[PDB]
Amino acid sequence: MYHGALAQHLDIAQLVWYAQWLVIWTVVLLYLRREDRREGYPLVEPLGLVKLAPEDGQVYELPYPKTFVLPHGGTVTVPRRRPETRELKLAQTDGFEGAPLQPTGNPLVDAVGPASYAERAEVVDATVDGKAKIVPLRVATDFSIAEGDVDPRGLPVVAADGVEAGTVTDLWVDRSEHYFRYLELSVAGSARTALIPLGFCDVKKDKIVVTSILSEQFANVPRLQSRDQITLREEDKVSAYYAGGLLYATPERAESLL
Amino acid sequence: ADYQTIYTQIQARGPHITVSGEWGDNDRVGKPFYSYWLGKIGDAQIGPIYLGASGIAAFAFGSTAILIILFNMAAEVHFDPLQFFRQFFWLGLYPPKAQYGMGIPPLHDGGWWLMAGLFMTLSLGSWWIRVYSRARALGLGTHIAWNFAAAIFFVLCIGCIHPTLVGSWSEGVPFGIWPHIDWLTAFSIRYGNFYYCPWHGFSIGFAYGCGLLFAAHGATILAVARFGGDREIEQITDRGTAVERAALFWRWTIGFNATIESVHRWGWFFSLMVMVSASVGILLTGTFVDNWYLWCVKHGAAPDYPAYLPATPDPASLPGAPK
Amino acid sequence: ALLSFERKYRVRGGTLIGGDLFDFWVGPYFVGFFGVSAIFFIFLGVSLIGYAASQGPTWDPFAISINPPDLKYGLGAAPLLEGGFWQAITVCALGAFISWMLREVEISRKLGIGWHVPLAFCVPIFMFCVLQVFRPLLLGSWGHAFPYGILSHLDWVNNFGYQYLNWHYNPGHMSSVSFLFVNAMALGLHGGLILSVANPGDGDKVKTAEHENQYFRDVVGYSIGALSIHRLGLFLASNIFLTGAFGTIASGPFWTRGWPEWWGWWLDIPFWS
Amino acid sequence: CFEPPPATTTQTGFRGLSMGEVLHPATVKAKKERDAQYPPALAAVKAEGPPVSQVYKNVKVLGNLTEAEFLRTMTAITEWVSPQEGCTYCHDENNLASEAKYPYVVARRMLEMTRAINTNWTQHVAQTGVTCYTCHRGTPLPPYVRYLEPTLPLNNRETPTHVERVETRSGYVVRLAKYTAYSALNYDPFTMFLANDKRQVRVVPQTALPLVGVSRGKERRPLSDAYATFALMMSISDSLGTNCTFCHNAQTFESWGKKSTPQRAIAWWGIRMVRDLNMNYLAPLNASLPASRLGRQGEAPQADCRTCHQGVTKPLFGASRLKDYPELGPIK
Ligand code: BCB
Ligand code: BCB
Ligand code: BCB
Ligand SMILES: C/C=C1/c2cc3[nH]c4c(c3C)C(=O)[C@H](C(=O)OC)c4c3nc(cc4[nH]c(cc(n2)[C@@H]1C)c(C(C)=O)c4C)[C@@H](C)[C@@H]3CCC(=O)OC/C=C(\C)CCC[C@H](C)CCC[C@H](C)CCCC(C)C
Ligand SMILES: C/C=C1/c2cc3[nH]c4c(c3C)C(=O)[C@H](C(=O)OC)c4c3nc(cc4[nH]c(cc(n2)[C@@H]1C)c(C(C)=O)c4C)[C@@H](C)[C@@H]3CCC(=O)OC/C=C(\C)CCC[C@H](C)CCC[C@H](C)CCCC(C)C
Ligand SMILES: CC(C)=CCC/C(C)=C/CC/C(C)=C/CC/C(C)=C/CC/C(C)=C/CC/C(C)=C/CC/C(C)=C/CC1=C(C)C(=O)c2ccccc2C1=O
Ligand code: HEC
Ligand code: HEC
Ligand code: HEC
Ligand code: HEC
Ligand SMILES: CC(C)=CCC/C(C)=C/C=C/C(C)=C/C=C/C(C)=C/C=C\C=C(C)\C=C\C=C(/C)CC/C=C(\C)CCCC(C)C
Ligand SMILES: CCCCCCCCCCCC[N+](C)(C)[O-]
Ligand SMILES: CCCCCCCCCCCC[N+](C)(C)[O-]
Numbered sequence A: 001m002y003h004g005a006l007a008q009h010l011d012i013a014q015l016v017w018y019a020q021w022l023v024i025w026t027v028v029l030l031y032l033r034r035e036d037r038r039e040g041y042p043l044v045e046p047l048g049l050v051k052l053a054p055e056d057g058q059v060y061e062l063p064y065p066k067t068f069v070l071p072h073g074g075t076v077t078v079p080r081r082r083p084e085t086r087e088l089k090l091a092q093t094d095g096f097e098g099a100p101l102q103p104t105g106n107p108l109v110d111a112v113g114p115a116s117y118a119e120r121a122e123v124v125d126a127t128v129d130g131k132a133k134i135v136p137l138r139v140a141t142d143f144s145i146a147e148g149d150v151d152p153r154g155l156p157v158v159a160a161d162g163v164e165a166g167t168v169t170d171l172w173v174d175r176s177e178h179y180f181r182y183l184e185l186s187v188a189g190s191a192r193t194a195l196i197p198l199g200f201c202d203v204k205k206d207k208i209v210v211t212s213i214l215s216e217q218f219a220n221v222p223r224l225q226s227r228d229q230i231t232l233r234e235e236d237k238v239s240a241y242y243a244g245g246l247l248y249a250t251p252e253r254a255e256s257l258l
Numbered sequence B: 001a002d003y004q005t006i007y008t009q010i011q012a013r014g015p016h017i018t019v020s021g022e023w024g025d026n027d028r029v030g031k032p033f034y035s036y037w038l039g040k041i042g043d044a045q046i047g048p049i050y051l052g053a054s055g056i057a058a059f060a061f062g063s064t065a066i067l068i069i070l071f072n073m074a075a076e077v078h079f080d081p082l083q084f085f086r087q088f089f090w091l092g093l094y095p096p097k098a099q100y101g102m103g104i105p106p107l108h109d110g111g112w113w114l115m116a117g118l119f120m121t122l123s124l125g126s127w128w129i130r131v132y133s134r135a136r137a138l139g140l141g142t143h144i145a146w147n148f149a150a151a152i153f154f155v156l157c158i159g160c161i162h163p164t165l166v167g168s169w170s171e172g173v174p175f176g177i178w179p180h181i182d183w184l185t186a187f188s189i190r191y192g193n194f195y196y197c198p199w200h201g202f203s204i205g206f207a208y209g210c211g212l213l214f215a216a217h218g219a220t221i222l223a224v225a226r227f228g229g230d231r232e233i234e235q236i237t238d239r240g241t242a243v244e245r246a247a248l249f250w251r252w253t254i255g256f257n258a259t260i261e262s263v264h265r266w267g268w269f270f271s272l273m274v275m276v277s278a279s280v281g282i283l284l285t286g287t288f289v290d291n292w293y294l295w296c297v298k299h300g301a302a303p304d305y306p307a308y309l310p311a312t313p314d315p316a317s318l319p320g321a322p323k
Numbered sequence C: 001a002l003l004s005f006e007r008k009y010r011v012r013g014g015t016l017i018g019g020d021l022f023d024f025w026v027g028p029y030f031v032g033f034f035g036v037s038a039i040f041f042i043f044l045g046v047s048l049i050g051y052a053a054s055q056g057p058t059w060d061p062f063a064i065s066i067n068p069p070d071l072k073y074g075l076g077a078a079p080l081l082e083g084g085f086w087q088a089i090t091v092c093a094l095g096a097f098i099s100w101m102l103r104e105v106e107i108s109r110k111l112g113i114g115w116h117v118p119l120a121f122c123v124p125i126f127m128f129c130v131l132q133v134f135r136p137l138l139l140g141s142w143g144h145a146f147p148y149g150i151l152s153h154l155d156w157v158n159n160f161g162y163q164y165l166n167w168h169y170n171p172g173h174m175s176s177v178s179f180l181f182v183n184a185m186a187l188g189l190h191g192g193l194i195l196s197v198a199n200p201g202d203g204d205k206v207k208t209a210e211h212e213n214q215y216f217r218d219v220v221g222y223s224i225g226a227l228s229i230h231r232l233g234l235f236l237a238s239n240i241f242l243t244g245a246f247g248t249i250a251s252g253p254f255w256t257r258g259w260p261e262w263w264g265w266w267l268d269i270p271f272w273s
Numbered sequence D: 001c002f003e004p005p006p007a008t009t010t011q012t013g014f015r016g017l018s019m020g021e022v023l024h025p026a027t028v029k030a031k032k033e034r035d036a037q038y039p040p041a042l043a044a045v046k047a048e049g050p051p052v053s054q055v056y057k058n059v060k061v062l063g064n065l066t067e068a069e070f071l072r073t074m075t076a077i078t079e080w081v082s083p084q085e086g087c088t089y090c091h092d093e094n095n096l097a098s099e100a101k102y103p104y105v106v107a108r109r110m111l112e113m114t115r116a117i118n119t120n121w122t123q124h125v126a127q128t129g130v131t132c133y134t135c136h137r138g139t140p141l142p143p144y145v146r147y148l149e150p151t152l153p154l155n156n157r158e159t160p161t162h163v164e165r166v167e168t169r170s171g172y173v174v175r176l177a178k179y180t181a182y183s184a185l186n187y188d189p190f191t192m193f194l195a196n197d198k199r200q201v202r203v204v205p206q207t208a209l210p211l212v213g214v215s216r217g218k219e220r221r222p223l224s225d226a227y228a229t230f231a232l233m234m235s236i237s238d239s240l241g242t243n244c245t246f247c248h249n250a251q252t253f254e255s256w257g258k259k260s261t262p263q264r265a266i267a268w269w270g271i272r273m274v275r276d277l278n279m280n281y282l283a284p285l286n287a288s289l290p291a292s293r294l295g296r297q298g299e300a301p302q303a304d305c306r307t308c309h310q311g312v313t314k315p316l317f318g319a320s321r322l323k324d325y326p327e328l329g330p331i332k
């Protein structure tokens, strides 16, 4: 007689094998794949004439809503309907639904394609104790640049066209993570300052090189409502602007690389 | 390129911050110091650290375990200091070589091994409590502790549950660098090649899966660091262009995508399954399966190949063959 | 057919080659030139696998095996059924992986994000080449590569290991295993951490970045940081293969003995022998 | 600590299973040269006259040989075993029938053992056979022998370090490791499997599920048995300068048929032959050898796979002298 035997050709291990696959597929399909749909669903499609009947499938693929209790008040529930009413300066290049869109104006200013920003809340991201998280050093008095690293203040900013476009006046630090996220510069020939994400800055000892956009384009960088604060949406607006340059700074950037 | 994703060009220094816990705030010890070079790729601050009862209990039990192991290893080289450092890797504390069934083995043949195992176990349980407690103290979910529990369970399976299930302490895992390694082959050989153990395969699938996932997730976040993708928490409570782009990169590539929060659920799951699958595999071994290869052959899953050199009959089964 | 926030990102541009010719989507899938070449190689590869398997002795998924040629064929072409198929399939595999990789680059450019993912994806492709191309070239025969079979490839791994008495003592392997293990652990920790902060339980408030720092400073005395752990994860996973490749390439071409004996350079130093 | 390419590789299994030898050319040639020192066969002599059983006085084994043949054999024996010492190593300069010197009686038993090997263990030595040289390699004391405890160096012609001395307890692990291809396996495969036929090498179950009656508690063989078998196999591999795939398809170590090579069955017979040599020829020699030859337990030096093979799949790369010295077997 054998341990694990249950019949002519049936044993314990064999049964557990089936159970294991069942557990895996159940967790993957019924749980994880639904959690994957707490953002962006239901999917969308250009309505034709008469079509407003919610398919059963749109209900089945979604999980029950969950609600996040925010640390500084309020709540967020997902999933939830979040259509984007904001007009988009884009036009269809061809007829089929899989065709790419093409900007109709200035993609950097119109904020489309890689220049697009999310509809984040117009609220200042906060620290655990309630203060503004991302602020310039002129404000974050107790914060400094570690000894050994370049102090960008006073240094010039050179754009992709090699032209100097401004002078760095300050650094914005993340008071929650002790980390610099933006540089503030005075824009040449303009009565405005602009922020630039550090990830778009090649920090040299004698200059700050920026290849994402041309000097002329620093003029249209999104502006902040305040001088010493920035909202989650502004952060997205500012970051998206430069990312947009990667593809739109010049006519050839969007065309085939090779 | 984004140099920030490689290292931190300009480091920042600021006041030491502390988040108060529901308790033990006065148990944090050490003065925080900063490392400039560390700050190039991580946070520059080192310490302070939290002590606590469970934490201290852990080091105490753990230290006892280690001493039992080191002393026995030292005995192996007749306490010669130079030979000890030389032969370290080859030294070990072994479980009973003789078959005593489930009987407590004599100190010289399994006794000390069992004792060390006991103290290691206590050390792990104590550390588990610390991992669990700190989360509670800080008002955090206990997801880490539950993942940690799966790993501890696996250790217990190869450590003493499987030995108990078959009734022999001899099956335990030795303490030592090469020795715990040698056990892997001894075990696989005894149980008919672990490659044919479905749960070994599942575990590997998930282990390899973790490599795939952290590589992809890690790369995904660096790719969107310019949009604050690293600030995952608020990207969860308030979707930013960072995760919209992350999701689309993946949807456009493989046809589907996760959310910034769910991708962590997938990661957590894959990680947990490496240990859960491994445990199930061990629990079934010896208990209900003696030879995994034959088990696969029995269910017609094993591949077969033509002979290259002539097929060789077992000489032992030939007529007149010696014993 | 579109995520609620997707349309604004679906613009033209970002390709490496092809331009507007293949710059479009089919369902949620971006195509591009490399999507076309990818499908081409996949279709081709799968066709070869099906045809080769049909010539085989079984249709059972676990037993099907398409093997490389005998060592005697060296680096030359082998007859279809005797390794030729394996050779053709290997080429299609390579074509499909590299296309897939290059396709991710086009997707990255279009979205204005870093190219880190395709870069990361090069690591597993590299390892495939070490096993199937480089090592076989150094040993002089395609016959040293692994077979395409769900279980048969495990048999190859198995014998390969044992050809060096005990593969566990291979130092490149020791490093590889360590990274595999650390990475799995770190992913669980990172996954768990993020979930524990956004899902505290009951009706408590979502926590913060400061809480993440506090948790690990308390538990292990150090907090590496949010962006850093992602950089570390990519590093730990990539090194599973980057370091492992050394242990693989070394076996045969640079070491023909058992791996344990390799440790003699240490054990046999005259000073303590 | 690496070996420069190219590497010589053979195939011993179906394409794609990665089964085969992996050799470093320099090493193979160095062994070929060492083994090439095998003295050539002495010129054949015409059998003329009466059998030495009549001619000489104390010939118990080679008595059927004529005087010329017999002396030819003594010359070969001297060249294989004691070339440096000469005939007087086993003989009294003034009486060739005297058994006064121990090498004499030992050599007599050895003549029997050798003839036994070439006659009764044909399943292993085939038509290649062995001669005194196979093991002795020109010295009374064979370079590769084993005592009841691991000794270092493996080649006794080498001078031991203090630590390698069997008396030095702190060197035990290394002595064991060097005998098991450097592994850390805490078992000595010689005393366990080759000195006698007490233990069973196989440890792998022959059924998919655990048979009730032998799978629980004290009914089970301890896992230590598996480590031991592995150690034996490491030892065997290093002794022939080969790897596991030379005999097994690792897919299933316990299977024969297509899962094993002819070489595995030959090795199987080698194990039986080695046990026979140790139990019935070498071990007993402790009663006829000086204490200086015995081990710490009064055991006579014994043989293992290396004793003959010395790191080559075939001793002396297959060289044979069987037809040149039929007196050594096979005996009809
Ligand atoms: C020749 C022998 C073989 C073998 C034998 C083997 C065995 C015997 C076992 C595995 C198992 C496993 N194997 Mg296999 N294996 C694996 C991969 C794997 C893993 C996925 C899995 C173990 C999971 C793990 O993370 O352990 C690493 C993680 C561990 C040990 C948990 C750590 C927990 C943590 C609490 C520890 C904390 C430590 C404290 C600091 C310690 C302090 C101590 C002090 C106090 C003394 C691969 C990828 C391959 C390949 C490519 O060939 C392979 C081949 C083989 N394995 C061979 C066929 N393997 C296991 C399995 O899945 O069985 C089904 C198993 O038991
Ligand atoms: C040097 C060591 C090697 C190794 C060692 C290894 C071990 C020891 C084990 C596996 C296992 C597995 N391996 Mg192998 N392997 C496989 C694929 C596979 C899967 C059948 C399975 C689980 C994969 C997984 O979850 O990973 C992580 C990836 C995930 C989670 C994403 C999903 C991947 C998907 C499952 C892949 C499915 C592949 C298909 C079966 C066939 C693909 C071709 C088709 C489309 C024509 C591929 C595709 C390749 C290639 C192309 O290089 C490869 C190379 C190698 N494996 C190396 C030769 N592999 C395990 C197994 O169960 O074997 C049966 C196992 O035990
Ligand atoms: C007896 C033999 C053994 C052995 C033999 C062995 C060998 C011979 C090798 C390893 C290697 C490795 N082993 Mg070891 N091993 C490992 C772990 C590991 C890995 C870390 C490492 C790399 C695996 C690899 O190359 O994947 C390869 C995976 C690839 C190439 C994936 C390619 C994916 C591809 C790019 C895309 C595929 C796409 C699909 C086809 C798409 C399908 C689409 C569908 C899903 C829609 C562990 C944890 C253990 C344990 C616990 O014992 C172990 C034991 C052993 N190994 C045994 C002792 N091991 C390798 C190494 O690095 O050694 C240093 C190696 O060469
Ligand atoms: C799939 C998921 C997996 C997974 C998961 C997870 N893994 C976790 C967690 C999760 C989720 C945790 O939450 C927990 C943790 O906390 O993370 C920060 C943890 C951990 N995983 C560790 C090791 C690890 N994980 C491995 C594997 C996997 N993990 C798998 C892959 C492996 C492998 C690969 O072998 C290893 C080696 C430890 C670092 C840690 C436990 C600490 C402990 O339990 O120690 C207990 C305490 C001691 C040993 C104390 C004694 C120590 C000292 C130095 C002795 C001093 C002696 C001296 C004489 C004293 C006097 C000195 C004198 C000067 C005065
Ligand atoms: C160190 C870092 C690691 C790492 C990293 C990353 N991994 C990535 C990415 C990153 C970063 C991606 O961006 C890319 C992706 O998109 O993610 C979803 C990807 C992917 N990782 C896959 C499989 C995977 N990753 C493995 C390992 C690691 N990944 C390691 C751990 C393993 C192991 C361990 O076995 C597997 C099996 C695919 C799912 C996917 C590519 C599919 C493809 O290429 O599409 C194009 C190709 C096809 C759809 C099929 C082509 C079939 C050919 C023509 C015919 C068959 C040939 C074949 C050789 C037969 C084999 C048979 C088999 C039984 C022997
Ligand atoms: C019909 C046709 C042939 C058309 C032509 C066009 C064309 C080129 C089509 C391609 C068709 C093909 C070949 C499809 C197969 C695609 C493949 C390879 C699918 C494999 C999917 C697998 C098995 C992935 C393995 C990893 C895994 C288990 C992932 C699940 C979780 C996900 C979705 C992770 C990805 C993911 C990660 C890693 C993040 O970090 C992240 C961060 C923030 C938001 C989202 C994400 C996110 O989605
Ligand atoms: C030990 C290894 C020996 C060496 C070296 C030589 N001889 Fe020997 N010899 C040996 C034995 C055990 C025997 C007995 C053979 C038997 O079948 O029983 C002998 C015998 C002889 C004899 C016969 C003497 C007699 O019985 O009258 C002769 C003549 C003889 N040996 C000669 C001889 C010479 C000249 C040698 C060197 C060339 C020589 N022997 C070496 C063992 C050994
Ligand atoms: C390996 C299988 C052997 C073959 C074949 C022959 N000999 Fe041997 N011999 C062998 C061993 C392991 C030993 C024991 C250790 C020892 O050196 O005593 C010996 C010993 C002898 C001796 C005595 C050596 C001494 O101590 O001075 C002699 C003289 C001897 N062997 C002779 C001899 C002859 C003539 C052989 C062929 C007929 C022969 N040996 C074969 C192992 C092996
Ligand atoms: C031929 C020269 C061999 C080499 C090289 C290796 N093995 Fe072997 N092995 C061989 C034989 C003749 C036997 C049977 C012994 C007997 O007395 O019947 C074995 C057996 C094993 C086993 C046990 C199989 C069983 O039925 O339980 C194992 C697990 C094994 N061998 C493993 C193994 C490994 C890992 C090797 C390289 C280190 C190896 N073998 C080499 C002959 C030969
Ligand atoms: C001398 C008395 C031997 C001892 C002790 C062992 N072997 Fe041997 N082996 C010996 C000879 C003369 C031969 C014949 C060679 C020939 O040409 O046929 C062999 C051969 C083998 C083989 C065959 C290898 C091949 O290429 O075919 C193997 C695999 C082998 N021997 C294994 C082996 C093992 C494992 C031993 C210890 C248990 C062993 N041999 C001892 C002589 C002697
Ligand atoms: C009491 C009763 C009735 C039953 C108890 C049953 C019980 C719960 C038993 C449990 C047994 C268990 C869990 C055993 C498991 C053992 C396992 C899995 C061990 C595995 C591997 C061990 C290894 C690798 C460790 C070896 C040891 C070391 C390297 C020594 C320690 C070294 C250091 C601390 C570093 C020192 C550095 C310094 C010299 C500079
Ligand atoms: C690592 C994978 C090992 C082989 C696993 C093979 C599948 C399990 C065995 C077959 C189970 C199903 N069956 C044949 C009963 O239908
Ligand atoms: C060890 C094997 C683990 C297999 C895990 C498979 C995970 C990927 C499943 C993707 C399913 C996708 N989809 C869109 C069909 O739901």
Ligand SMILES: CCCCCCCCCCCC[N+](C)(C)[O-]
Binding pocket: B254, B255, B256, C028
């Ligand atoms: C063994 C696990 C295999 C998982 C294979 C998953 C294939 C998924 C193919 C893309 C699915 C696309 N989608 C979601 C749009 O339908």
Ligand SMILES: [Fe+3]
Binding pocket: B217, B221, B232, B264, C190, C194, C230
């Ligand atoms: Fe993350």
